[PDB]
Design a protein around this ligand. Structure first.
Ligand SMILES: CO[C@@H]1O[C@H](CO)[C@@H](O[C@@H]2O[C@H](CO)[C@@H](S[C@@H]3O[C@H](CO)[C@@H](O[C@@H]4O[C@H](CO)[C@@H](O)[C@H](O)[C@H]4O)[C@H](O)[C@H]3O)[C@H](O)[C@H]2O)[C@H](O)[C@H]1O
Ligand SMILES: *[C@@H]1O[C@H](CO)[C@@H](O)[C@H](O)[C@H]1NC(C)=O
Length: 426
């Protein structure tokens, strides 16, 4: 797809800190861009929509190639249309925003310039950020994560895509998402099927796969840390059912303190170690062995990831023994079939793009994160309970109606060698 300018594109600025092993941190200046799927896609020569609701224009988009040629992605009014705003090193995303249309959440990427994404090499380094999840009720997910996307959004590999990173193209993750309207410089209209419950989305014949590091997926009730390996490290297209776990691990080796047994660590109020009604700091370290360490800071008090005992595993580090014990006790073979932490280390050794989003779940109502899932299981089933939310929570239409003002705020992003981000920001 190409880019149009009926609406100017001005990326909300966002500062972050780059720290060094020497003990100092210096301020960096970037910005954020919204994913192409949220944009208005219309004819290059008019305002005629190429996509509207959950259907494509059969005239402008008879096939994937013709569609990409006839259509372009336009600019976004971040605040008024998408409820996305920034201030210094802080970024906020509102749940429901009413403009000429209703918009739900957003997915944003940190940029290095107005035409390129900022790439981060996680291995040997740590990522720190502050987050306020107080306005995130059951059913919502304020997420901060990394994915192995190309810095240019896919332009060099697929010339038919001239919009690039400036317009949020090139997404990919361990779920091999088929809801993307544009992949590899072509549309995804071929084989398109409208969602049964989301008036704005559908499923195309192709998907976009790649390694995904979910540093943070959470709301005020539950939080999870989850690495997702893929047999092909970077962005790669998939077709039909091949997208269903053919190359990527959609489940991952997840670490949810609540799911692992400590139901008093993360929650609303002073009855929890970390009070989710107030802002908190989350630091994640990627040691060279491939393991992942985590600690939190709130009101000046430091807490390492809480200890967990699962099978023969005991500790607070997300390592091979933990992931192996999890599949043995909770079930599944996806993570290990795809190479585990060894394969995932190939992703963190390379460059990954920072993603920040807010979403509700049309497939499983976010029950996998904050409730008992599947809903027919009980507390007696290992790993069934992930949070205190009712198994009846998270219905999109309901949370969108009852909590339109929900929002997540990410701030004070700091990146550098392990042990360096706790030093003074520059
Ligand atoms: C005896 O047979 C075995 O039984 C066990 C237990 O019943 C089976 O294991 C269970 O299988 C369930 C379905 O596969 C999963 S639910 C699964 O949970 C994961 C972890 O939360 C979810 O992954 C997350 O998905 C999010 C939304 O896409 C992502 O954003 C996030 O990054 C992912 O971590 C997934 O969506 C759910 O479907 C149980 O966890 C598991 O114990 C076993 O399969 C049988 O063989
Ligand atoms: C949860 O973790 C906190 C901090 O490590 C600890 O003080 C508390 O005892 C733990 N509770 C349980 C039930 O593990």
């Amino acid at each position: 797809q190409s880019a149009c300018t009926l609406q100017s594109e001005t990326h909300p600025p966002l500062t972050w800190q780059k720290c060094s092993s020497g003990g100092t941190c210096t301020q960096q200046t970037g910005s954020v861009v919204i994913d192409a799927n949220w944009r208005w896609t219309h004819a290059t020569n008019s305002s005629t929509n190429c996509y509207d609701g959950n259907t494509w224009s059969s005239t402008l988009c008879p096939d994937n190639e013709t569609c990409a040629k006839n259509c372009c992605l336009d600019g976004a009014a971040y605040a008024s249309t998408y409820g996305v705003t920034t201030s210094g090193n802080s970024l906020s995303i509102d749940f429901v925003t009413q403009s000429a249309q209703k918009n739900v959440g957003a997915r944003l990427y940190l940029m290095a310039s107005d035409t390129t994404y900022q790439e981060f090499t996680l291995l040997g380094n740590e990522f720190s950020f502050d987050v306020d999840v107080s306005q995130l009720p059951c059913g919502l997910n304020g997420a901060l994560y990394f994915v192995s996307m190309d810095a240019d959004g896919g332009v060099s590999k697929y010339p038919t895509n001239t919009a690039g990173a400036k317009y949020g193209t090139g997404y990919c993750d361990s779920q091999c998402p088929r809801d993307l309207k544009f992949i590899n410089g072509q549309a995804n209209v071929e084989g398109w099927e409208p969602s049964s419950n989301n008036a704005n989305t559908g499923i195309g014949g192709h998907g976009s796969c790649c390694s995904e590091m979910d540093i943070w997926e959470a709301n005020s009730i539950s939080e999870a840390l989850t690495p997702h390996p893929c047999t092909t490290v970077g962005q790669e297209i998939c077709e039909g059912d091949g997208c269903g776990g053919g190359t990527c691990d959609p489940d991952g080796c997840d670490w949810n303190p609540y799911r692992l047994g400590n139901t008093s660590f993360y929650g609303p109020g002073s009855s929890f170690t970390l009070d989710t009604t107030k802002k908190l700091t989350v630091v994640t370290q990627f040691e060279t062995s491939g393991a992942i360490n985590r600690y939190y800071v709130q009101n000046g008090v430091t807490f390492q990831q809480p200890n967990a005992e699962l099978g023969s595993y005991s500790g607070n580090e997300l390592n091979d023994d933990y992931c192996t014990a999890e599949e043995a006790e909770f079930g599944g073979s996806s993570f290990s079939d795809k190479g585990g932490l060894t394969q995932f280390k190939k992703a963190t050794s390379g460059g990954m793009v920072l993603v920040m989003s807010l979403w509700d779940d049309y497939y499983a109502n976010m029950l996998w994160l904050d409730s008992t899932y599947p809903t027919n299981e009980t507390s007696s089933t290992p790993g069934a309970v992930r949070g205190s939310c009712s198994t009846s929570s998270g219905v999109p239409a309901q949370v969108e109606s009852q909590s339109p003002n929900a929002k997540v705020t990410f701030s004070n992003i700091k990146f550098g060698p392990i042990g360096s981000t706790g030093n003074p920001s520059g």
